[PDB]
Design a protein around this ligand. Sequence first.
Ligand SMILES: [Mg+2]
Ligand SMILES: [Mg+2]
Ligand SMILES: [Mg+2]
Ligand SMILES: [Mg+2]
Ligand SMILES: [Mg+2]
Ligand SMILES: [Mg+2]
Ligand SMILES: [Mg+2]
Ligand SMILES: [Mg+2]
Ligand SMILES: [Mg+2]
Ligand SMILES: [Mg+2]
Ligand SMILES: [Mg+2]
Ligand SMILES: [Mg+2]
Ligand SMILES: [Mg+2]
Ligand SMILES: [Mg+2]
Ligand SMILES: [Mg+2]
Ligand SMILES: [Mg+2]
Ligand SMILES: [Mg+2]
Ligand SMILES: [Mg+2]
Ligand SMILES: [Mg+2]
Ligand SMILES: [Mg+2]
Ligand SMILES: [Mg+2]
Ligand SMILES: [Mg+2]
Ligand SMILES: [Mg+2]
Ligand SMILES: [Mg+2]
Lengths: 62, 838, 92
Amino acid sequence: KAKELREKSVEELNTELLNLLREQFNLRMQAASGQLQQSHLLKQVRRDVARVKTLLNEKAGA
Amino acid sequence: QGHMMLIKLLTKVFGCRNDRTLRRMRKVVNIINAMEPEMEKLSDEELKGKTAEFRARLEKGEVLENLIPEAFAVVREASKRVFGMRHFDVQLLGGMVLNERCIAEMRTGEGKTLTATLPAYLNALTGKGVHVVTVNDYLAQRDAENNRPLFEFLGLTVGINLPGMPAPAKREAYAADITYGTNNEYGFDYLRDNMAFSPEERVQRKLHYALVDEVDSILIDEARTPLIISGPAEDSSEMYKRVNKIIPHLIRQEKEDSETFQGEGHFSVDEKSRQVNLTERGLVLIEELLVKEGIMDEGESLYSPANIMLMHHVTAALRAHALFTRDVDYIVKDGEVIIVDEHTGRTMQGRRWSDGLHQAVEAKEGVQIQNENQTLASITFQNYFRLYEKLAGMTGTADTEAFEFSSIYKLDTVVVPTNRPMIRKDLPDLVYMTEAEKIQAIIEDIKERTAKGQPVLVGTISIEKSELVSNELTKAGIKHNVLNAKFHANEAAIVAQAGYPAAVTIATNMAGRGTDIVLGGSWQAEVAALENPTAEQIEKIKADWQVRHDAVLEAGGLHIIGTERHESRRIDNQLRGRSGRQGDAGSSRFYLSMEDALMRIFASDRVSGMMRKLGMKPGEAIEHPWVTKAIANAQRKVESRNFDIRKQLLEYDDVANDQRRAIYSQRNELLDVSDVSETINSIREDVFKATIDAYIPPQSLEEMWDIPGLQERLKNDFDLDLPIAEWLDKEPELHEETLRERILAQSIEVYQRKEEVVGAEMMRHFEKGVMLQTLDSLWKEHLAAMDYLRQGIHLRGYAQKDPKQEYKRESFSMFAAMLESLKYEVISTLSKVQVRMP
Amino acid sequence: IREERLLKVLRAPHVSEKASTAMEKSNTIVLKVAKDATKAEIKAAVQKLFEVEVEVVNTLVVKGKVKRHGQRIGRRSDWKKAYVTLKEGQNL
RNA sequence: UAAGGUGAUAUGAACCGUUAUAACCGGCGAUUUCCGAAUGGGGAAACCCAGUGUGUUUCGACACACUAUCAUUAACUGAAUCCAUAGGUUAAUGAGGCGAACCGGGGGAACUGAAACAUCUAAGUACCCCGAGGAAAAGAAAUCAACCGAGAUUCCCCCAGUAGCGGCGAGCGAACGGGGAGCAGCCCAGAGCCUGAAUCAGUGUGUGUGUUAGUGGAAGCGUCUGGAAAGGCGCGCGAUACAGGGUGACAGCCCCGUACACAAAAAUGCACAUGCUGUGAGCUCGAUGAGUAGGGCGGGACACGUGGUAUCCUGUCUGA
RNA sequence: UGGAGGACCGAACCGACUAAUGUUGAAAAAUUAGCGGAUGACUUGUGGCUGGGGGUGAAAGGCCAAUCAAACCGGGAGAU
RNA sequence: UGCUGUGAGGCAUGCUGGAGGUAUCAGAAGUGCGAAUGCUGACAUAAGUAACGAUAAAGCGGGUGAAAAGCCCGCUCGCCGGAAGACCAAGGGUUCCUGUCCAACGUUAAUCGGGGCAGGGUGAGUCGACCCCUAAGGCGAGGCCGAAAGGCGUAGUCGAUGGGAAACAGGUUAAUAUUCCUGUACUUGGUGUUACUGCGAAGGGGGGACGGAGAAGGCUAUGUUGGCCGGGCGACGGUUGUCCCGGUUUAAGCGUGUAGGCUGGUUUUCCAGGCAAAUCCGGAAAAUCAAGGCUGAGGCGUGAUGACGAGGCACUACGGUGCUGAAGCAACAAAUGCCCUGCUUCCAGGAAAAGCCUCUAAGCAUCAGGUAACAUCAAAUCGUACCCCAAACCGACACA
Ligand SMILES: [Mg+2]
Ligand SMILES: [Mg+2]
Ligand SMILES: [Mg+2]
Ligand SMILES: [Mg+2]
Ligand SMILES: [Mg+2]
Ligand SMILES: [Mg+2]
Ligand SMILES: [Mg+2]
Ligand SMILES: [Mg+2]
Ligand SMILES: [Mg+2]
Ligand SMILES: [Mg+2]
Ligand SMILES: [Mg+2]
Ligand SMILES: [Mg+2]
Ligand SMILES: [Mg+2]
Ligand SMILES: [Mg+2]
Ligand SMILES: [Mg+2]
Ligand SMILES: [Mg+2]
Ligand SMILES: [Mg+2]
Ligand SMILES: [Mg+2]
Ligand SMILES: [Mg+2]
Ligand SMILES: [Mg+2]
Ligand SMILES: [Mg+2]
Ligand SMILES: [Mg+2]
Ligand SMILES: [Mg+2]
Ligand SMILES: [Mg+2]
């Protein structure tokens, strides 16, 4: 992504960050119970959060 | 490794739990059928007397469960001695499962109704009745007349419930110990019993036990469905003309006429945003539906819990005024409303958008308006099953998930065996890149299976898919019969003869588990086809059927073709489980293509393009099992999605029916009790305390009181012309409460004079009738507000709050205000009754 | 309490025979939680992310074992177990 | 830059990507827990405990920021004490610690050699401490020479183990002068004429030349032995490339490179050239570093051990 | 009557006079059988302080990490 | 192995090996080893010899097992019992418990283990740490001193081995429990309401707050006996009795205030000693009453119609669970423990500070703040397994 997220406002990025953290917690409880087969998604969700936070920093400081 | 985690925990714990329960059930089974070589004395004087003996033993307090190894045998040999069927051990297991609140899993042909004879017999000895539900009147009446010798030889009466039955005959149906009928007849008999004007006019008994008999459909899919709520002739609706008349005073820029206006809203080009969203989030234009000519004008705003019935009317008029435009979205010609379809260019003259929308469409123009219809009687089916004291149900090989079962309402899933070693060869699934190669491989399979001896079922989802597969099948060339869901007797006539060798049946949307496919033909319907069967013809037909049946099991049994996979796995297992019943040989194979509807849930063109990079390979290869893993994972995903969209409306049904049970408990509480003069007296004292509290403040001074408002309200809705200000100012010896007891005693003497001139029990019947009138009217207004707030929860709880405990608080306040208005207007119209005075 | 802090606390459900027995006796869920989580964070996280009510939380710190993998000596990481007491009126 | 990847033991599973948001490499950014100069107070390093000010939310608490010491400067205050000072508070800037060797300074052995040992030697070595820079130190004669002249400092070779010093023992050891590497001279102790005129430092721009990724890059087949050919034999080809490494034995022509020919969006080294800012040139008339040179006493450094001992430094008393 | 004592006898505790064993031992100082003190100049737990041309010593050149008529480690050092 | 040279050597070849070696004539050495009580590695010798680590001691049957003196179960025998039992601190860190294995470790075998592998296990407002406060002592802004580094030290700030708020009984896990469950409590803060009101310190006063030895009065833990309750009449003479065996338990907290110990009390007026002020302490002088106050083990009541209780009945995948459960008192003896941080007595004359109570100063006074009741909230963080006279700590060892 990182271009469709760069076209979003600060509250949109905050809402997307909250949704990504919720999906990360849900996938963590899913994988913790031995129930996750698609184990890649955690990694993707993790990097997704990073992208949002990086964009938040470059929307906050400059 | 390590971490023997929750999944293996689920499998191990529930496996050992079902095995321990099945071990104790096997011990009970080994107790009951230890030795049975010969039997005599059918049921004439001894085993019919066990009915009265068991009723006397429960009269002394012996547990009905302690009779389970006895009473089952009192059923069992009867089926040996009347119908010639020996109950197998699995039928005993299923009856013991249906005795508790558990789910019976067993294949068809293992005596389904023969198992269902057990818990109807057990639950019927209470003297309260047994309510077994089929989908039709046909199977219900058929098995009712089948078990009428079985229950009549044991002293139990079989009542049948049919649509169009008389209400005393419906009483004799429900007062029988085993009552047969369908689900909607049961539910609408309940709704007519709640529309009864006395407890004598009811036709049902107290709900004792409900045998579901098909838990796949009604407990999941048909859980919510209402078919009788309110039937109007509509008779007039011109008051909404005087509600929608308030709208063309205001302009569509601001002040309650807006296209939701969003602070700024939109640009000045065609502002009818048909993505409606119905918000108006400025919260300053909301003021113009208040005062100046009067409705919702006493001081309550538009966000009050007590004014939502008009709020789903005026906003319906707002989304009919500026949104749905004349001559393109709809037309009214000669007073007739026709939706003009914009996208495909149609004129829908026999369709109308419900939930007051076409009503507000008629209220905008000069059209004849159907009535603002008020809900009367509704219940959801899973919670009506929850209302029973004991609840159990049985299903085939398409059993749902055990945690899902126990979380419907307390249903434990124990895997009952078949008592026969299963050899139903489930072949690995076959997917092709397109529909054409898949159906051509299906054509080669059906031709090579019709070559030797094999009966085959080909199941689809629809009549048009059946038409396409039958067109390709006569391009190959066979005979087929399509299974119509509309035709029950034609369904039985097709499927009873579908098990013949070289007989192929096509299926459209299997409801559940089928009528018994007899492989190698069906010799029982064959000797039913004889016009006068002797004892010489039945043995020959049985022998030829025996040769056909051994040729069928040598051929590999019944074959299953699944043309697609459904959005639930239960209907897939329903299609699959037709082969190999009662331990017979059989085969099952599912087909799929990449242009099926189950590729519509992917919505990922990257992976959908990566499957194209494999190659064609139409046949011998090792192509990919990973795409099959993707299909299995996506199918489990959409099954869980169906679960979530079910669960949200299940919580909706829970809250709606909980308010329903509140009003039904207070309904039977205010109806069933005798001597209702004391009840009216107590409610009248609380009424006068509450109505004087609404106008006179408790423990207030002499200037805080509201004398002319209380006087005019007493005169309007009490028929009391009280000189309250004169009674204040003439005597200063008066003090506090005192006026409460003065107006109460004046009302009491008005009522006692009117009951002495009208009669005692005539006033009691007038009390119960006017209580029913005011209670049903204000309760159906409560139902209108409840339906309008379940459809109008789009503007209440948004910022950090949650409806449903914001819906529930406003509906509880509406409930309390409705009950106090009920009490106030009952006491009013009992004080308003003009009787001829001496 | 900030909600994104609550989304990082509860790491894993912990199932064993002791957790089975504790659920049967005093209906306590046993959680792997974060190493730096206090009892208020765990109580708020279970009350929010699971929509239930908590009476009390008892947290203990499990010290990791020391293993020999191919004659190389390592030490497993410490973690925090948490016994969370669901309320009696809540029935499951 | 790319058709392959998700670092390794190390497979497996789940995935991503194939003509350009897979991966990789380089530039610039973001985040950068806690301890550690550790810097809010403390501490048994990776821990405990706060204060102050904001700003939230149901009022249960949360999040962020700052708060060490010293030096200088400024402001406000402010004793004994009148003014004032000392002190106090706040703000601004700088410092602190680490680092292998080189460098300058403050201290400074002993074994040993003398065939013992004390003057001496080892040796101003080892080590300790302080301070700084990419170099440091030194440096423009109160210097040498010899009646002829040289013209700052540093380093290399001769002078020369010479002259000397020395229980004249062990040992220590120049200089004058010559050949070379390199080369550069200025400012204050002060006024006027003229100004901002030379020079230097910062700053931006352009060009050149690098650095930090990269691109292209020649020319071989048959046969025999052999597990395998790059080897033997036969006939060809390239070379501004026969440096090297790998490929189943020893390959110029199989692969990576190699000679050569090119390449930077961004940061950046160094040169110029240009612009701005701070800075002042030249001319004339001045002035020419005082508790200093030198001396007495005591030490030290000069190759020079007090000897007939010049010269330099000074702890002490003096003193042009 | 009183209950003093660097009082008496004797376990814990502290110590170490005799003998035997042990002497590549069970132990780089012990075991067994006896022995001395055992309310005091006692003994013991925890923490702190005193640093080697030094400490400390009811004094034997004793002890200062199984090392002491000048500890241990690194360096001068490849001393001689 | 053969041939050859006077010798260091040389040449050829069989076998192994599977990829490098080098003529000749020159050049340079880390250029030749049997010795140095030489250094490292490997392997003999003594020699299958001494020894197998307290002379507390074993015997049999059954089980599993490939194999049983050592493991498990049972019946005997013997050893410790001021310990060779139980709980901790220090110290150690997974040795705890379960499954599994027997290569190595265990002075032997091992099916066993404190061993290998995997899994599980440590739950606190009241216990401890943390936290408030100080001793010895450490650092120590400034300061003083010192070639430099640094040394001493004021304000301060750390520092337990000491002072400071509160929980007990029963039950449960394979492994934790004053932590979990049941029951009954208690403590300290925050907020709010109500009622009353002079609150306030980095200051003053009290208190904390203290030695050795001896004595004998009241007690308790605890034990014995009797009564009671339940079971037994006993392999061999006797054993329905003055007989035999077992049980006869109950806390914290709340209330009462006892043996005992200390001290006269109350009111008024005055003094400036307590760095200033004080209603507090210190001192002085009157009046009045003589009994008022502080402290205090234990007992008693309650906690407790509960729990516990031998045993019995139902199940019981023999490991346990559900229900029931009789008596549950009295006398005597009695501590080194409690009254007691007391009393007497001696000389060697016996910590500090804070929490706590009180007094006011600056200051604020309808505020604030304090007092009492009630309601609510909070009590975070870390430790908690296991061994602790020992096979797990210090001794190289599973160490007399
Ligand atoms: Mg608790
Ligand atoms: Mg610090
Ligand atoms: Mg001089
Ligand atoms: Mg002895
Ligand atoms: Mg010496
Ligand atoms: Mg050599
Ligand atoms: Mg040798
Ligand atoms: Mg032997
Ligand atoms: Mg011998
Ligand atoms: Mg021997
Ligand atoms: Mg032994
Ligand atoms: Mg044996
Ligand atoms: Mg003994
Ligand atoms: Mg271990
Ligand atoms: Mg063990
Ligand atoms: Mg084990
Ligand atoms: Mg072990
Ligand atoms: Mg302190
Ligand atoms: Mg302590
Ligand atoms: Mg006693
Ligand atoms: Mg006898
Ligand atoms: Mg007895
Ligand atoms: Mg006084
Ligand atoms: Mg041993």
